[PDB]
């Protein structure tokens, strides 16, 4: 259920499934946005102010991407595009949620090792970006998919939509 | 027990039950209000000062509303009306508590994915607003409902009741 | 054991037991007082300074009082009298502790809903006040009650006892 | 094991055991002292500076002392003497630790009620003081007691020993 | 699984396995790097700013290295090289991750003892450094290893790569 | 396993084992040292700066030493020597780690009592000092001991080694 993959330009991960070959296998993502809307209690309009977005926080094991992720950090390396993709365990293994970032960087890379229990050390990566898109897809109780829900998004270079 | 649904103007969720078609299915809500009454210990009257209210914090899975919720955030999108509704599992599936917000915005949208366990990622949404109403309904031990308890509320535009 | 009820002037709760009809059924109360006695280590006398008291923090389910409690908050509504009462499960269901507040307000009302597990949402209410009284009653191991322990208390309008 | 009792001048608690009639039965005490000795790393001598002591934090159920404890708080009531006593479950139910405070006050009284589970609400009391004494007594593996370990202590009025 | 060893110049640990004789056996490592990339939302470029790296936090039992580690701390002792190495439990016990630090110091040494349960006290060591290298190696599902992933790294003396 | 004893000059504890008669039996110790080595990222050398050490935090039950420990606190009492010693459960009950402090004080004494469960109240003592030594001893898998690992240490009066 909710198997998550993520793609970086010229950065081979280790995945194996048909639709995500050499992608990076990821556990959790965590991501957020929201504006500066106060509870005011004195102003007539709402007053949304400015828009804002959060880094994406990826969790995953060590793989073949580690070293590049490690270097990316201290290198301030610019990527054109990061694609996040969560795909259904059942149904048709399709992506019911397709995220898309543009102008991405690794803002932090962390590493740590349980020691003697769970296999594979675990890393946590923070991906800073400029632009992004949501895209969601429902699933027919009959197993199959349904219509895709209008790909929308936002840009921190323009402070406009999509 | 305590099944919670929530409605937004022109924002189809995914619900299915008769009374809440295409509504957004929600787990928890959390909401609060209260004034600035100090323990003083020097003033003769009570001294309630100003009134205040909190954002509503919704919890729910990803659905078809996600993308719109996502966009709403960075878009500062204004909605006329948000209706919250908690409905009894037994009895007559009626709403024993009907909340009503007027002039609503999404102040924050957060996203996160367990990775490989529970199904469906989970989002947490903060809804800023201008006005609102409580409304509660008791339930007859004989299963059925009882009289509705006077719909009351408050406005941050007037700082008056109802 | 330790069943707690609480009464507000013209504010029907939902209780049912003989001695507390239409009272508000409550789970926890939490309450505190104490003065500003420092560990000094330089002054000869003790130096109690000023007296102080805390809000009472009530916990309970949603009931018929909710809406009034909700309104009370933003309304800064003044009540003459709040009576707290904890009554023995065994023995004679009598109140072994009788609290009494005078000039009460709701300083905050909070709401929240588990989602799908425990029944009934849960609210937490903070009651600000001016005056109050303890009153305790022992219980005879023979089941029955014993003498009542001198009703005492204090006032924040006078900073005197009882 | 480690049954704790505590005595206040003209303040009947509820205890029953032979050696502690009408004393107040207590669960935990928590107490501390220590000076202002820094890790310096620049000064030749140690440099203990000033001496200091902590309030005693008592935990216990509601009893017949509650009301007096409650009043003591807001009243800044001065007591001459508080005796703490921890007594062995086995052996001879003797006190292997005898604490003694002089010039005591209640600096805070807190109250709280679980609601519906454990019996008896629980209060936490902070006792401010001027002077105090330790006294400890070993126990013969043969069940019986041993010699008492020199009653020592300290005073915050003199900043001298015993 | 994920057995971790670490080597210091002229500092015999206690390990025993063929490939890591007299090395120091370690449980967890924890390590991190990342730059100062803000979510900006006003600047056109990304703006990675400066690069930065974290201390390495080692966890291990007391061994023969303890005393030297202890002395290193207060001595500010400079080492040329610290090699970290995590080796597969299965396959060929090879190191699928080879870390390499240059110009290392012990910035802190901590000690602590459970008391009576787990064997061996536990120490936590922080290793400050100047330079370092990642190096990772995949593993053939057929048990054996695969190609090594380009040894990269970074230097805080140059603020350049590798 | 890892049985810990500690000795103070003219301060009889309660221990019983042959090698530690009347010593104080202790559960945990916790102790630390380390210098002020920054991650700099601008300076060429390492830059260890100053050396520093932590108090030793002892945990133990109440015994015959309590009262003296209690008095030591408020008395700022100077001891010449504190010896810490952790001894193997198996093998030959020898001390595989011998700590030695010189010019010791009790900087804090804390007390607390579970109430009715675990036997014996528990105290936590902080020992401030001037000087100290590590000393470790390996153990032959054949049960017996091995060579002792050079007794080293440090002084806060000189800021030199051993």
Residue numbers in the entry:
A (entry chain A), B (entry chain A), C (entry chain A), D (entry chain A), E (entry chain A), F (entry chain A): 2 to 163
Which text from the study accompanies this structure?
The type VI secretion system (T6SS) is a recently discovered protein transport complex which contributes to bacterial pathogenesis. Secreted proteins of E. tarda T6SS include a Hcp homolog EvpC, a VgrG homolog EvpI, and a novel protein EvpP which is not commonly present in other T6SS clusters. Our previous functional studies showed that the major secreted protein EvpC is a key member in the EVP system of E. tarda and the secretion of EvpC is a critical step for the function of T6SS. The overall structural and sequence similarity between EvpC and Hcp1 strongly suggest that EvpC is a member of the Hcp family of proteins.
